[PDB]
Design a protein around this ligand. Structure first.
Ligand code: FAD
Ligand code: FAD
Ligand code: NAD
Ligand code: NAD
Lengths: 478, 478
């Protein structure tokens, strides 16, 4: 065991933790970050955002090249095949480069990178213990004398009791992202974004995808109209939805090399049997504090397993802050990053801020689905008087030119002030376009404020312009 | 001779004119629009923006299937060849749909659409003349007595004296957009946006492209660094450049089936002989007023051939406004539309508005090139002290996952106010991302204002957020 001192020590190297480390160092703190997995970037970079977006993008292109080339004047007299090994390689190389990038950022900023497991020795010190196989891991235990501690231990997949998750036949998102072969049938439990995205990926590559969802509609969180329109275009794309249906159990049938599933329709409590070569368990994600030693010092943990904090990210101990997926708020990478930054700026200047009323959500299917601000259900349930502004991409020149016009832009404004209250988009670049609504929302802009800004022609962004025109006045192209 | 009365009469159905018509109608004006070509949408929709973007998008895919497929896990065996007829059809279909679309907007908005040539009868009356082979043209001359006239006759290709454009071997942008076969060699006069886009299209299709440019750099009005980087990635994609070189002459040679070109090295005053199956003349575009009868009533026309107007779009006659390509300002479609709306709004409330300092410019190559506001050269010339924020897409997670990392975002801010003065982007979706710069500038946003807005992860837009972070402080992932 050996002693070490730092001003700030971050437990966790994911979006919230490594960004907090970089920021603390730029702000002048002697900073250290403790991560046990072997690479920085956390869930997002290693088994989440990055690899999933890589598969989505490449699977989309394969799809375009396979069924949309001829109508674009491109004749292929040969064959268009998916090379699973190179498909995976493309994703693994992207992850590899990015994880390396973070380590380089840590070096440039002088962040001390401890490879091991971090736990509270007591409320004022952190002990770093080595990880057996992990190379580069600490040679012996390290006791870090620190002034400020930031907990960013993140999340884990929510387990399904009774379902043995082997990342081969019955997989979690982590297994789905590394499938060595396109399964004939992909059955997915849960209609969440993570599940839907993996569904889209594989059906594009030739898998028969079935989505078993407890609730009536899917999406969970998106605007009503967006949610139904989403399930609509996904079914149209080949995904089979089993709404109001509960997965009961499942186990791998090695002899028949098939996963036997058992569902139950809630609108009849009538049981049923299903089968799939690969089963994806996507019933959500939850906070992860295992091995942290939070129980040792009395850190408050709510009934949902989240580390309780106040509006300044403080735990019951003023010098111990908590950020990211391990605590309150949507479990998104951009949210985690800004909390990491806000927490550190607080340490430096005494203040920081995160706008929970302006955090966007995005599903990277095609078309993409993105939204930020308030939905219609939320405005109604709050008795807010509002007006709607909608513009379809079918009326957008750029979209038409791309022969890809599915979707629309919907702007929600205050009937009184005409201030933008929410934006919802389903379109070819929804994820990027949503940044526009974010800027408007952040500044409290009005639909007219956006409508009056000259947007380049011909671009998809013009749909956003016209949708705002339709909210307080009238669109020109529809 | 037929007689009719209208509140507003618009000459020209291009972006400025047809949008003015729609707007005038919406604002309760008895509106009429006169167009002689046979389709609405003017230059942009029939032989400009739309057709070019279509060729660019489809040729981009062709290029991707040839060079980007394998590394993405997509095996495409066998010849991959362009079907010119179908390539042309894909473009022609998009134009047909869009032109048909505007006519539906006219019917819906009750705009009187006169197919023929519009010319001034006197200061307050316009006559519509039938057009020789115009489908659906007026069968008899019409005399429209109007309260307000809006001129939007647009522009045309600037010819090169001594060189005859036949749209077969020696072509203008119009002929280039409809080439029946991919020329073994395509040589282009002028490295403006139009010249560069056509060059990119055919180079991707197999033509050996050569760009002859009089100036020392391409782009015409790009920021210095952007112009250089633009030439570099276009050169990397196969285009050959001959800077500080002006064409002197060129002529067809039906014996060798080639165009014989003569150019002059501006540095050595020495000439060179060039040869190409197809020559594109893209030395620019100019205002169009032929057959408008502007001289009959003595409208003011400057040395550039433009119809002079005041800051209210007024000609020497208070009731005669002018908008679009035929008058002052950049010759772009979104600029024209904006003026069309502004003019009409002035006729209604007595005031319209166009922020000429926030008009974006975009080249739809790949990567795309987009900018708005001041370039570095313009700031220096003004003696303005400024700071730079630069972030490369090579450091952006989404760009990495897409295996498309060329380019960067450059933000220019006032050193004292930290107010954003301009944005320049070279990237996969620059054209869409520039809208963010549009909103920021319009609202007087500072770099910090943009940097603190939560941008979804992982998106290309995060690079816009980080470039701003670097401009006034420090980027995280840089
Ligand atoms: C398949 C999938 C796709 C996703 N796609 C998106 C998307 O497109 N966009 C988006 O915004 N979000 C997406 N997310 C969610 C996003 O990944 C998370 O919100 C984000 O990674 C959380 O970051 P964090 O830093 O709070 O936690 P984490 O990223 O979970 O990381 C915490 C880190 O700390 C380590 N750690 C924990 N305890 C200890 C300890 N005691 N000692 C040392 N290290 C410890 C972990 O090993 C881990 O690396 C996705 C998630 C999944 C699973
Ligand atoms: C190859 C090419 C690519 C381009 N790409 C882009 C791009 O990506 N983005 C962008 O913003 N801009 C682009 N532009 C430019 C854009 O097309 C023009 O700025 C815009 O179309 C001008 O619109 P306007 O309404 O002022 O004029 P125009 O569109 O030129 O139309 C004027 C109209 O009036 C008619 N007319 C003229 N005189 C008479 C008369 N006497 N009687 C009746 N009708 C008459 C014409 O026939 C025509 O339809 C491009 C141009 C070209 C040539
Ligand atoms: O991630 P998430 O939190 O977005 O949602 C998980 C989704 O899976 C669904 N789900 C959870 N357990 C399920 C089960 N046993 N059967 C069917 N759907 C289930 C939930 O209703 C929810 O829509
Ligand atoms: O406005 P704008 O007109 O500058 O930009 P533009 O967009 O019209 O660009 C036309 C381009 O062609 C070039 N050009 C014009 N006449 C030429 C000639 N005779 N030989 C070679 N290049 C020539 C110009 O330098 C400019 O870069």
């Amino acid at each position: 065991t050996i002693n070490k001192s730092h001003d700030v020590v971050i437990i966790g190297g994911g979006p919230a933790g490594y960004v907090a480390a970089i920021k603390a160092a730029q702000l002048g703190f002697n900073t250290a970050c403790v991560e046990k997995r072997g690479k920085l970037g956390g869930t997002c970079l290693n088994v989440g955002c990055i690899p999933s977006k890589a598969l989505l993008n490449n699977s989309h292109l394969f799809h375009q090249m396979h069924t949309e080339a001829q109508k674009r004047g491109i004749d292929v007299n040969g064959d268009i095949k998916i090379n699973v090994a190179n498909f995976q390689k493309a994703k693994d190389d992207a992850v590899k480069q990015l994880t390396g990038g973070i380590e380089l950022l840590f070096k440039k900023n002088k962040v001390t990178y401890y490879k091991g497991n971090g736990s509270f020795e007591d409320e004022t010190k952190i002990r770093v213990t080595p990880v057996d196989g992990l190379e580069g891991t600490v040679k012996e235990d390290h006791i870090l004398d620190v002034k400020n501690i930031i907990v960013a231990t993140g999340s884990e997949v929510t387990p399904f009791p009774g379902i043995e998750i082997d990342e081969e036949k019955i997989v979690s998102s982590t297994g789905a992202l590394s499938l060595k072969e396109i399964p004939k049938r992909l059955t997915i439990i849960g209609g969440g974004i993570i599940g839907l995205e993996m569904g889209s990926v594989y059906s594009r590559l030739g898998s028969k995808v079935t989505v078993v969802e407890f609730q009536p509609q899917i999406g969970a969180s998106m605007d009503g109209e967006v949610a139904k329109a989403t399930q609509k275009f996904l079914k149209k794309q080949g995904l089979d939805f089993k709404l109001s249906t509960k997965v009961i159990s499942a186990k791998r049938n090695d002899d028949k090399n098939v996963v036997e599933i058992v569902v139950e329709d809630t609108k009849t409590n009538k049981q049923e049997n299903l089968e799939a070569e690969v089963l994806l368990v996507a019933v959500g994600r939850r906070p992860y504090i295992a091995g942290l030693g939070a129980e040792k010092i009395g850190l408050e943990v709510d009934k949902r397993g989240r580390l309780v904090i106040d509006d300044q990210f403080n735990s019951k101990f003023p010098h111990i802050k908590v950020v990211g997926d391990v605590t309150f708020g949507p479990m998104l990478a951009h949210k985690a990053e800004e909390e990491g930054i806000a927490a550190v700026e607080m340490l430096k200047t005494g203040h920081g801020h995160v706008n929970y009323n302006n955090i966007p959500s995005v599903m990277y299917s095609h078309p993409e689905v993105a939204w930020v601000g308030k939905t219609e259900e939320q405005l109604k349930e709050a008795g807010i008087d509002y007006k709607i502004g909608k513009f379809p991409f079918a009326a957008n020149s750029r979209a038409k030119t791309n022969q890809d016009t599915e979707g629309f832009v919907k702007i929600l404004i205050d009937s009184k002030t005409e201030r933008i209250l929410g934006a919802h988009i389903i379109g070819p670049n929804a994820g990027e376009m949503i940044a526009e609504a974010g800027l408007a929302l952040e500044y409290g802009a009005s639909a007219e404020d956006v409508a009056r800004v000259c947007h380049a022609h011909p671009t998809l962004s013009e749909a956003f312009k016209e949708a705002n025109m339709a909210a307080y006045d009238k669109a020109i192209h529809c």
